[PDB]
Design a protein around this ligand. Structure first.
Ligand SMILES: [Zn+2]
Ligand SMILES: [Zn+2]
Ligand SMILES: [Zn+2]
Ligand SMILES: [Zn+2]
Ligand SMILES: [Zn+2]
Ligand SMILES: [Zn+2]
Ligand SMILES: [Zn+2]
Lengths: 370, 142, 574, 86
């Protein structure tokens, strides 16, 4: 009777992870189902043929609301912008053909069947799926897929075309993405699009959702691209530029090389724990905090590694001074913790726990903006 | 497959016309897949040049590559022959343009420059001499 | 004897083995004949080959005859005999590894070639406490390289399965209680530790396996149809041990310390350690203010023990801050009481940090009596006399006191909180009348939920015999309270003694739901309208406040500052 | 009178009377101790400093700041102390 309502008598300021992002892994069959559902929804709300619906969808990144309001605004300009309707004896192979063998698009440019059959095959062999368009110059009217299937001769092709269409459809969809790993039939789905950390559940590949490159937490996707590409009075300018590039690159490369001694220190810590266990100075459960400390140290080093490119581009001001001060403090704490965990013979559980709490707080301080 | 009829028709058409902007051209002794050109624009006013036309198979369905043999001074032309032609490009290509239109566009682009050599583009930001004197010197040198 | 009589010597050794200076002499002859290549190439090779042939021909027969039952004993005896014979015969005076080679051959011929058959029974032998045979099996298998991994795997699986099955088997009782849960955990831990000690002589690898298996068992959440119930139960047990309860009454200090040490040992394997120190903090917060601690030094040492076992520092630091604030507040209260010379010896004050303790400056609205209203400025000035830059927030959910109740039968003493006190002072000016729900809401300035909870507390106390207040419409839960319910003060309350003291505070709440200012604004506005109507009527018709109290005996009791500002408004508007 | 009062106990919470309630250097609550002082297990000694620019920081953190640079972290005015805690 005294201990009845205890579970509801006990915060949102620091509890939340400032690097949390919810996603879900999808296979090809489920992607097919999702795309088909969207197709049969839009092609009914906005009654058209299914292929026309797909061409409209790819142009606007598969956003139902925007398409559906632009339709009520002006359906005519909606269709025109999707490159379906034109904006308001064969010129390819100069010959004469019976009218029964003439096929034309909505733009009404007339060419015979043989060149239509060969053009699509040649462009498919190149590796394009949506780039097919009309032959005559200066008309961007793309061809729906139901106008491309009957032209393709064989069954070896007609399956590469579907793969290309699937790839382009997934690329254009704002909620889906493809795993950058080699030969991975996996698709990532997120309710909202943002630049965060995404991990595959099959090949365990870590990448950013938008740029598909390596995860870059406190740095814009385009900012790191030019850094990766890079990596008299004008003489002084060049000397100073090289000097500051070296001043940042020394720490960048320190951490880059350090991200292999992660596993190497894991090995030494395993050795030390095994030694202290085999000398009967305790049990296994009494020495497990060193591994957690090592993981925390590696995480902090990664975070610090991906801040120097971001600090290289700040405009001089109080924010730069504060960021540098906090960076120095976190570096000092990192060195102190590493010295206590790696090159010490004794150990105090309370002291190491307090140091771990301080180090975690110091790391969390830097991400106050992101 | 259809990489022949268009070729013979185009050769007959260009032979019948006999334009003055383009002086003469040879079939390179029954090659049927490539030949060599000779343009004559009317800066680069004086001088007859040589252009190597590259016609892949299914010529109407593929972009004909363009290159220059004799080195000439132009912002849009690379060191030896690598010149990018928007009409015959990879993206802005249509299987309906014929060789006459593309050679006319080439003559136009030779007639006046477009603001690959980024250094010559930077010169072209404020170019009068660096396009009217050195270019004349090279053209009359070659 | 380069090659002659070597066969005879080997035959003699074989006959002895089946069932003495010549062999030693021949071995010395090889040793000293010619640095010792001849001894390594011959004789030694013949000895090893004869041993291998004899055992490769003999062992399966005895295996088939005596089962897996007698094979381990036979093997141990054979290795002991071979080791003794090898020391007796083979050379050992020149630092040679012949005995090591023979021992390796024997191990490879008697144990390695049957490891699957030996290990097939390990799963069944661990259960039903076959420790005597398990020790022999472990001793034999420790020689072969990496041959004890299946033993560890079987121990892991047995511990996990047995723990889950035993905890499921008694689940209709364990979940509700806490002491039974802790006793079950300790029973399993002790049984498994005793098994390991008796069967494997405290080998570190088996200790590691037991630790992993126990960690798997403790953190399982199959019970409760799955959450986070284990830390709550552990905190409840610690509270029962550390509070003035009958369990703590019938025990001494040493037993309490032993129980706390056992709880810490069990808790060392808990994964989600961020919930235990959030429940323990609340229990300690409740205990340090009601002053219901059985012992203080045990509580002081508990925080150090918790720091040692591996708790996060973010809560241990707060606990230490709490313990220091208790002493600081005691000194401050003594100083205030000495300086202040409602009697001054019946008032206590506590000033506590806002970080370690509850951290929320959310306004809570309640009507206070005259004494408590006048006490606040004195305390505020006393605090501001010394400290600079500090501001005080008064916490009405954690204040308490004792009041006197005069009835027809007699008088008693009641232990109440602020809300109960405010509710009870509604009948001071109308002792024999009845008050409805709406008038109680207006008079006490309380929201709906808090008023309902306080009314339930004062009308239906769990173990009480005769209640203090009375309701007209019957109900079975506080949720079904209407605005037509009338409340009256009982006039036959007792406990039939004519004096005593009872407690109405059980597990005082520390947090409440969020407050909305719209209802408070409306109640206050109605207060201004009612007070202005009453004062205007009295003017139309020193002792002014007395007659205000006399006439406003059915709505509420007006306050001094409200009356002053209202009369200022009146004289402003004539 | 009925329902008199006999004995009372009062509980109050104290906190610093500041604005923006953050040290702006360690980004922790001003009402809690700084990292170093809670690491050294010494309490009741972290006072809060105010400046002429109405900036309220810890004394420990701002002393470590002014050991290198004599300016406010959040502005550029020449830092000078106006009021100190406790
Ligand atoms: Zn055609
Ligand atoms: Zn067209
Ligand atoms: Zn993948
Ligand atoms: Zn990115
Ligand atoms: Zn600070
Ligand atoms: Zn401090
Ligand atoms: Zn400032």
């Amino acid at each position: 009777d005294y201990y009845v309502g205890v579970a509801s008598d006990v915060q949102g300021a620091d509890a939340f992870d400032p690097e949390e992002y919810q996603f879900t892994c999808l296979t090809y069959k489920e992607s097919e189902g999702a795309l088909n559902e969207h197709m049969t929804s839009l092609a009914s709300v906005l009654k058209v043929s299914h292929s026309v619906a797909k061409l409209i969808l790819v142009n606007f990144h598969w956003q139902v609301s925007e398409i559906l309001d632009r339709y009520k605004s002006n359906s005519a300009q909606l269709l025109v912008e999707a490159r379906v309707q034109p904006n308001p004896h064969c010129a390819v192979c100069m010959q004469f053909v019976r009218k029964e063998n003439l096929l034309s698009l909505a733009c009404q440019h007339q060419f015979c069947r043989s060149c239509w059959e060969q053009h699509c095959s040649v462009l498919v062999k190149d590796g394009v799926g949506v780039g097919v368009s009309c032959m005559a110059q200066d008309c961007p009217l793309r061809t729906p897929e139901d106008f491309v299937f009957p032209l393709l001769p064989n069954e070896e092709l007609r399956e590469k075309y579907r793969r290309y269409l699937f790839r382009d459809y997934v690329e254009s969809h704002y909620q889906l993405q493809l795993c950058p790993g080699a030969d991975c039939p996996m698709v990532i789905r997120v309710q909202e699009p943002r630049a965060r950390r995404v991990q595959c559940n099959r090949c365990n590949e870590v990448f950013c959702f938008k740029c598909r490159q390596m995860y870059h937490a406190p740095t814009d996707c385009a900012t790191i691209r030019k850094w990766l590409t890079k990596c008299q009075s004008q003489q002084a300018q060049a000397r100073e530029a090289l000097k500051k590039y070296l001043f940042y690159f020394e720490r960048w490369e320190n951490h880059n090389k350090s991200l292999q001694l992660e596993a190497q220190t894991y090995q030494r810590i395993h050795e030390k724990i095994q030694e202290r266990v085999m000398n009967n100075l305790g049990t296994w459960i009494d020495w497990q905090y060193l591994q957690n400390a090592a993981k925390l140290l590696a995480k902090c080093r990664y975070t610090l590694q991906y801040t120097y490119p971001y600090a290289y581009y700040m405009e001089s001001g109080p924010r730069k001074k504060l960021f540098e001060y906090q960076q120095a403090q976190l570096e000092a704490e990192i060195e102190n913790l590493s010295w206590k965990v790696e090159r010490a013979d004794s150990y105090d559980r309370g002291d190491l726990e307090n140091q771990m709490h301080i180090a975690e707080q110091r790391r969390r301080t830097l991400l106050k903006d992101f | 497959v259809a990489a022949s009829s268009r070729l013979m028709k185009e050769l007959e058409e260009i032979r019948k016309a006999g334009m003055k902007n383009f002086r003469n051209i040879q079939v390179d002794e029954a090659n049927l897949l490539t030949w060599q050109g000779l343009i004559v624009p009317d800066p680069y006013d004086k001088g007859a040049f040589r252009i190597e036309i590259n016609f892949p198979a299914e010529y109407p369905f593929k972009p004909p590559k363009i290159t220059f043999k004799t080195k000439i001074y132009h912002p849009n032309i690379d060191e030896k022959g690598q010149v990018c032609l928007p009409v015959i490009s990879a993206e802005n290509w249509k299987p309906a343009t014929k060789t006459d239109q593309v050679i006319q566009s080439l003559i136009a682009l030779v007639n006046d420059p477009q603001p690959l050599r980024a250094d010559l583009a930077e010169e072209y930001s404020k170019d009068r001499k660096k396009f009217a004197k050195n270019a004349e010197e090279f053209t009359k040198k070659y | 004897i380069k090659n002659r009589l070597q066969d005879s010597a080997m035959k003699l050794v074989h006959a002895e083995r089946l069932g003495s200076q010549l062999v030693i002499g021949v071995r010395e002859s090889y040793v000293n004949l010619c640095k010792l290549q001849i001894y390594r190439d011959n004789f030694e090779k013949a000895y090893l080959d004869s041993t291998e042939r004899f055992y490769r021909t003999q062992a399966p027969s005895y295996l088939q005859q005596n089962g897996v039952q007698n094979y381990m004993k036979y093997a141990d005896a054979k290795l002991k005999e071979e080791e003794k014979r090898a020391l007796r015969y083979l050379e050992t005076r020149r630092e040679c590894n012949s005995v090591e080679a023979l021992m390796e051959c024997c191990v490879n011929a008697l144990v390695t070639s049957f490891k699957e058959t030996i290990l097939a029974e390990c799963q069944g032998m661990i259960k039903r406490n076959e420790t005597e045979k398990l020790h022999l099996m472990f001793s034999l298998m420790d020689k072969v390289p990496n041959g004890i991994e299946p033993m560890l795997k079987d121990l892991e699986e047995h511990i996990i399965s047995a723990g889950l099955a035993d905890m499921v088997a008694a689940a209709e009782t364990i979940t509700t209680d806490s002491e039974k849960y802790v006793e079950q955990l300790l029973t399993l831990f002790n049984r498994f530790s005793k098994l390991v000690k008796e069967a494997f002589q405290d080998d570190p690898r088996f200790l590691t396996a037991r630790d992993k298996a126990y960690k798997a068992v403790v953190n399982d959440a199959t019970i409760f149809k799955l959450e986070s119930k284990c830390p709550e139960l552990l905190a409840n047990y610690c509270d029962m041990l550390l509070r003035k309860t009958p369990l703590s009454k019938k025990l001494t200090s040493e037993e309490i310390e032993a129980k706390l040490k056992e709880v810490l040992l069990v808790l060392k394997y808990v994964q989600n350690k961020d919930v235990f120190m959030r429940y323990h903090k609340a229990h300690l917060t409740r205990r340090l203010i009601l002053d219901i601690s059985a012992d203080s030094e045990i509580e002081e040492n508990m925080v150090e023990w918790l720091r040692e076992v591996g708790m996060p520092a973010d809560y241990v630091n707060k606990l230490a801050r709490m313990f220091q604030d208790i002493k600081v507040s005691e000194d401050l209260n003594q100083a205030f009481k000495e300086m202040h010379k409602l009697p001054a010896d019946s008032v206590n004050i506590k000033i506590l940090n806002a970080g370690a303790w509850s951290r929320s400056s959310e306004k809570v609205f309640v009507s206070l009596p005259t004494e408590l209203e006048d006490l606040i400025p004195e305390v505020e000035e006393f605090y501001k006399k010394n400290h600079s830059g500090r501001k005080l927030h008064w916490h009405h959910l954690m204040s308490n006191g004792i009041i006197t109740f005069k009835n027809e039968v007699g008088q008693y003493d009641l232990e109440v909180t602020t809300f109960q006190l405010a509710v009870l002072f509604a009948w001071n000016q109308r002792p024999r009348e009845k008050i409805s729900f709406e008038n109680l809401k207006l008079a006490t300035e309380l929201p709906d939920a808090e008023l309902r909870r306080t009314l339930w507390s004062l009308v239906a106390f769990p173990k009480l015999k005769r209640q203090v207040l009375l309701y007209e419409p019957q109900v079975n839960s506080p949720k079904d309270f209407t605005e037509g319910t009338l409340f009256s003060v009982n006039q036959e309350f007792s406990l039939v003694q004519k004096r005593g003291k009872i407690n109405l505070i059980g597990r005082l709440q520390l947090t409440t739901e969020r407050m909305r200012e719209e209802e408070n604004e409306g109640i206050v506005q109605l207060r201004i309208l009612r007070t202005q109507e009453a004062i205007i009527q009295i003017m139309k018709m020193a002792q002014l406040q007395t007659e205000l109290v006399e006439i406003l005996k059915n709505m509420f009791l007006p306050q001094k500052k409200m009356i002053k500002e209202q009369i200022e408004w009146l004289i402003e508007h004539k | 009178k009925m329902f008199s009062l006999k004995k009372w106990n009062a509980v109050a919470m104290w906190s610093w009377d500041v604005e923006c309630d953050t040290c702006a250097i360690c980004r922790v609550q001003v009402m809690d101790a700084c990292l170093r002082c809670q690491a050294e297990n010494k309490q009741e000694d972290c006072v809060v400093v105010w400046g002429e620019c109405n900036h309220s920081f810890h004394n420990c953190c701002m002393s470590l700041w002014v050991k290198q640079n004599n300016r406010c972290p959040l502005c550029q005015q020449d830092w000078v102390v106006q009021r100190i805690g406790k």
